[PDB]
C-alpha cells in the first residue's frame, strides 16, 4: 500500500490544548494530567473521499523557552495547524504577534488552519466568572474567523477535545489542505 503521507506540524500557546487534540484523534483517551510537550511525533490515518491517507503528526512545545528548539520540526511541512484556546483571548492575540511571523518565516506558502480549542469552555460557568475578573470574555466565533482571514489561513474550525466536538472535521480539512 504505497499510501500518500503528508506532514502536519501543530503550534500554539502553551496549554491551549495542542497535544489533547492529537491524542484524541488517535488512541482516544483524554489525559486528565498536563505534561507540557517538548518534542513528540505521531502517525495517524484519516479518510478523505475514498482515500486512506497516512498523516505524520509533529507536536511542538508551546512554551517560549523552547523557541530555538521548534524549528527542528518545520523542515518539510505540508500543512500547519495553528491553535489558540477559546477560554483565552490572550492566547488568540498571539496569533499575529508571535505564531504567524514564525510560521511564515520558516514555512513560506505552507497552508495554515486556524483552530479554536476548548470550545466547551465558551459556555463554562467558572471560566466566564474568571475572565470577567480581567475585563474580558471568551473568544467569539466571529473573532476567530476574522483572525483567520487576517493571517490568510486556509480556514477556521473550532473544537473541544474534551467532548470531541468538531475534531474529525479539524483533521479532514488539514488532510484536504496539504493536498
Amino acid at each position: 500500500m504505497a499510501a500518500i503521507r503528508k506532514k502536519l506540524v501543530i503550534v500554539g500557546d502553551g496549554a491551549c490544548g495542542k497535544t489533547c487534540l492529537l491524542i484524541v484523534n488517535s488512541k482516544d483517551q483524554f489525559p486528565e494530567v498536563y505534561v507540557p510537550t517538548v518534542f513528540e511525533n505521531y502517525i495517524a490515518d484519516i479518510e478523505v473521499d475514498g482515500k486512506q491517507v497516512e498523516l505524520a503528526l509533529w507536536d511542538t512545545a508551546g512554551q517560549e523557552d523552547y523557541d530555538r528548539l521548534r524549528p527542528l520540526s518545520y523542515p518539510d511541512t505540508d500543512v500547519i495547524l495553528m491553535c489558540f484556546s477559546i477560554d483565552s483571548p490572550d492566547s488568540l492575540e498571539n496569533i499575529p504577534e508571535k505564531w504567524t511571523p514564525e510560521v511564515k518565516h520558516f514555512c513560506p506558502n505552507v497552508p495554515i488552519i486556524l483552530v479554536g480549542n476548548k470550545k466547551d469552555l465558551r459556555q463554562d460557568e467558572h471560566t466566564r466568572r474568571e475572565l470577567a475578573k480581567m475585563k474580558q470574555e471568551p473568544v467569539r466565533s466571529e473573532e476567530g474567523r476574522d483572525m483567520a482571514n487576517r493571517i490568510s489561513a486556509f480556514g477556521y474550525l473550532e473544537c473541544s477535545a474534551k467532548t470531541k466536538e468538531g475534531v474529525r472535521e479539524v483533521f479532514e480539512m488539514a488532510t484536504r489542505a496539504g493536498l
Binding site: 518534542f39 523557552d65 523552547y66 523557541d67 530555538r68 524549528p71 527542528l72 523542515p75 518565516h105 480581567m134
Partner: protein
C-alpha cells in the same frame, strides 16, 4: 553521537530543568534530532542582515526587514546570535538613534523586540552591557503613549537591575534615567508614575511597579533604599498606588506585596539606626562635631543650613517653644521615618 546532542542543547538556550525531558529520550530519537539540527544550519545569514541594516532602509522596508531579523534572533541557534555579534547590535542601536532625531514607532518597537531576543541569553546581555548607549537607549524607549514598547523596555531594564555579576547594575540603569531627565525639563520617575496612571493597560502598570522594585531590591545600602523610595513618595506614589490595590491581577498583586514589605523592612531598620545614633550622639558636643566634619564643607551644606534656618523661625522669647518643638519633632520624625512620609498630603 551524544556529543553533538550536548552542542545542540547548549545552542538552544535551555537551563538545566528545561533540558531534563530532552535527556530522557531514546538514542534513536536523539539521532533524528541531531540530524534535524545539523541540516537546519530558513532565511539570510548574519552578515546579510548587517548589510541591510547599513544600507539605510526606511518605512515598510525597514520594518519588513526588522520583523524578519526579529524572528531569527529569536528562533535560531544561540550561535547565530554570536555571529550577529557586537556589530549587529551596534548598527541596531545606530538605527534607534537616528530614529529619535525624528522626535514610525513600529520600527523603534521592532528593534526593541530584536534586542529582547538578543538579550534572551548570556552572550547577548554581556555584549549589551559593553555598549555605550544600550542602557540609555532602552530608557529612551519607555514612552507611556507607546505602551507596549514601554512594557518590553521596562522588563528588559528590570532584568538588568537584578544582575549580580557586574556590580551596582541598578545604579547603571538609574543613571540613565537620571541623564535623560536632565536632558528634558522633567522629573526622572515621571514616565513610571505616568504609566501607573489609571486607564493605561494593566500590563503597563505592572511592569512600571516592577522596575521600581527592581531599582530598590538589589541595593546593598539602606540609604539608597530609603532615599529613592522617598523621592517617589514625595511625587505622590502613595496616591497612585491606592486604586491599583483593587485590581484582581496575579502579577499586580505580587508587586504591591514586594513594594509594601520593602517599605516596612527598610524603615523598621532606619528606626533601628536611630536607636544607635541616640546612644552615640546624646548631646550638642557630639552633634556640633558631626556637622563640622560631615556637613560643613560639602555639597550637603546649603541644604542643611536651610533646614536649621527653618527650624529657628520662632522667636526665642516665645512662651511655648518647648511645646512647639515637641510638635515639629513629630513632623520631622514622620518625614524621615514613616515609609510614605515624604507625601505632600498625609
Amino acid at each position: 553521537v551524544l556529543v553533538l546532542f550536548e552542542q545542540m542543547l547548549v545552542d538552544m538556550n535551555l537551563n538545566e530543568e528545561k533540558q531534563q525531558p530532552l535527556r530522557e529520550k531514546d538514542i534513536v530519537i536523539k539521532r533524528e534530532m541531531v540530524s534535524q539540527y545539523l541540516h537546519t544550519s530558513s532565511s539570510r545569514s548574519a552578515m546579510m542582515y548587517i548589510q541591510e541594516l547599513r544600507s539605510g532602509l526606511r518605512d515598510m522596508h525597514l520594518l519588513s526587514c526588522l520583523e524578519s531579523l526579529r524572528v531569527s534572533l529569536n528562533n535560531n541557534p544561540v550561535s547565530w546570535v554570536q555571529t550577529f555579534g557586537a556589530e549587529g547590535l551596534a548598527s541596531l542601536l545606530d538605527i534607534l538613534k537616528r530614529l529619535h532625531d525624528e522626535k514610525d514607532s513600529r520600527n523603534q518597537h521592532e528593534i526593541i523586540r530584536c534586542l529582547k531576543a538578543f538579550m534572551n541569553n548570556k552572550f547577548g546581555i554581556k555584549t549589551m552591557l559593553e555598549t555605550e548607549e544600550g542602557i540609555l537607549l532602552l530608557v529612551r524607549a519607555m514612552d507611556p503613549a507607546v505602551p507596549n514598547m514601554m512594557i518590553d523596555a521596562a522588563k528588559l531594564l528590570s532584568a538588568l537591575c537584578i544582575l549580580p555579576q557586574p556590580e551596582d547594575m541598578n545604579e547603571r540603569v538609574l543613571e540613565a534615567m537620571t541623564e535623560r531627565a536632565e536632558m528634558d525639563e522633567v522629573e526622572r520617575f515621571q514616565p513610571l508614575l505616568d504609566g501607573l496612571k489609571s486607564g493605561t493597560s494593566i500590563a503597563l502598570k505592572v511592569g512600571c511597579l516592577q522596575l521600581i522594585n527592581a531599582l530598590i531590591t538589589p541595593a546593598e545600602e539602606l540609604d539608597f533604599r530609603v532615599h529613592i523610595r522617598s523621592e517617589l513618595m514625595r511625587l505622590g506614589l502613595h496616591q497612585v498606588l491606592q486604586e491599583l490595590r483593587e485590581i484582581e491581577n496575579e502579577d499586580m498583586k505580587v508587586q504591591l506585596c514586594v513594594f509594601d514589605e520593602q517599605g516596612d523592612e527598610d524603615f523598621f531598620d532606619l528606626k533601628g539606626r536611630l536607636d544607635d545614633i541616640r546612644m552615640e550622639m546624646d548631646d550638642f558636643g557630639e552633634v556640633f562635631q558631626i556637622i563640622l566634619n560631615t556637613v560643613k564643607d560639602s555639597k550637603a551644606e546649603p541644604h542643611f543650613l536651610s533646614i536649621l534656618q527653618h527650624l529657628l523661625l520662632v522667636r526665642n522669647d516665645y512662651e511655648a517653644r518647648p511645646q512647639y518643638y515637641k510638635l515639629i519633632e513629630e513632623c520631622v520624625s514622620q518625614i524621615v521615618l514613616h515609609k510614605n512620609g515624604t507625601d505632600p498630603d498625609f
